């Protein structure tokens, strides 16, 4: 099989697969909803950004969100979510990254993303509801890595993608 890259698209991902996103610049990286109780997204903020209100298109709506990135050297991924149609988005996990990669996976009713600071970012679970039916729309090129190969996803998120598009076969010893 071919891990990627795949171009921005919308689909409902199966459980037990990581989607590894490779955005180029700040903005919305990906979003997903179950159309019932969760509307979710990951935002990207470049280094060296003082607290500022930015506009993001989430599910077609114009949403103003106050963001900051105090890191001089690393990019900041921000997980955001709301739990009702008219609810406010709030910021949850963050991933402070030199690689500009983030990732999400549905497993066991939970939604996992990477959080922390590279090269020591780790998967962490959101478990406030059953997330199994949440779809995705990606706004960056992305790769698909099975949970059985989670070690490969961890290594890429923390250390970078290979310089060529052969991820199926490229892994550190």
Does a structural domain hold residue 171? no
Does a structural domain hold residue 98? yes
Token pair listed for 168: 């199926």
Token pair listed for 41: 């997204």
Does a structural domain hold residue 169? no
Q: List, as one string, the DSSP characters of 67-131.
A: EEE--SS-EEEEEEEESSTTPPPEEEEEEEESS--EEEEEETTEEEEEEEETTS-EEEEE-SS--
Beta-bridge partners for 45: 76
Does a structural domain hold residue 1? no
State the total domains in the chain: 1
Q: How far apart are CA 95 and CA 99, in angstroms?
A: 11
Q: How far apart are CA 145 and CA 95, in angstroms?
A: 19
Query: Which residue in this structure is represented by tokens 């298109």?
Result: 57
For strands 17-21 and 142-146, give the pairing.
antiparallel
Does a structural domain hold residue 28? yes
Does a structural domain hold residue 173? no
Residue 173 burial (CB < 10 Å; 0-12/13-18/19+)? exposed
Note the resolution in Å, 1 decimal. 1.3
Contact partners, residue 74, CB within 8 Å, separation at least 6: 47, 96, 97, 98, 117, 118
Q: How far apart are CA 65 and CA 60, in angstroms?
A: 15
From residue 46, alpha-carbon distances to 26, 70, 104 in Å are: 6, 10, 20
Q: How far apart are CA 104 and CA 24, in angstroms?
A: 18
SS3 of residue 27 by DSSP? strand
Token pair listed for 164: 């060529």
Does a structural domain hold residue 95? yes
CATH of residue 124's domain is 2.60.120.200
Range of the domain at 151: 10-160
Task: Spell out a b/e string for 126-137, using b for 16 or more CB atoms within 10 Å of the CB, else e.
Answer: beeeebeebebe
Backbone angles phi, psi at 152, to 5 degrees: -65, -40
Element (H, E) at 54: strand 49-58
Under 8 Å between Cβ of 31 and 58: yes
Longest dimension (CA), the chain: 48
DSSP assigned state of 165: S
Does a structural domain hold residue 166? no
Q: How far apart are CA 54 and CA 105, in angstroms?
A: 27
Solved by what technique? X-ray
Q: How far apart are CA 119 and CA 171, in angstroms?
A: 16
């Amino acid at each position: 099989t071919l891990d990627g890259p795949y171009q921005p698209t919308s689909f409902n991902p199966p459980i037990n697969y990581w989607l590894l996103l490779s955005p180029t610049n700040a903005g919305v990286v990906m979003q997903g909803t179950n159309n019932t109780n969760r509307w979710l997204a990951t935002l990207l903020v470049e280094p060296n950004v003082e607290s500022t209100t930015r506009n993001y298109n989430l599910f077609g709506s114009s949403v103003d969100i106050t963001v900051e990135n105090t890191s001089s050297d690393k990019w900041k991924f921000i997980d955001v979510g709301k739990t009702s149609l008219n609810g406010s988005y709030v910021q949850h996990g963050t991933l402070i990254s030199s690689t500009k990669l983030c990732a999400a996976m549905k497993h066991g009713g939970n939604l996992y993303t990477f959080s922390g600071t590279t090269p020591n970012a780790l998967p962490k679970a959101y478990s406030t509801t059953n997330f199994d039916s949440v779809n995705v729309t990606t706004f960056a090129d992305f790769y698909i890595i099975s949970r059985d190969n989670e070690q490969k996803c961890r290594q890429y998120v923390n250390n970078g993608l290979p310089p060529i598009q052969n991820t199926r076969n490229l892994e550190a010893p």
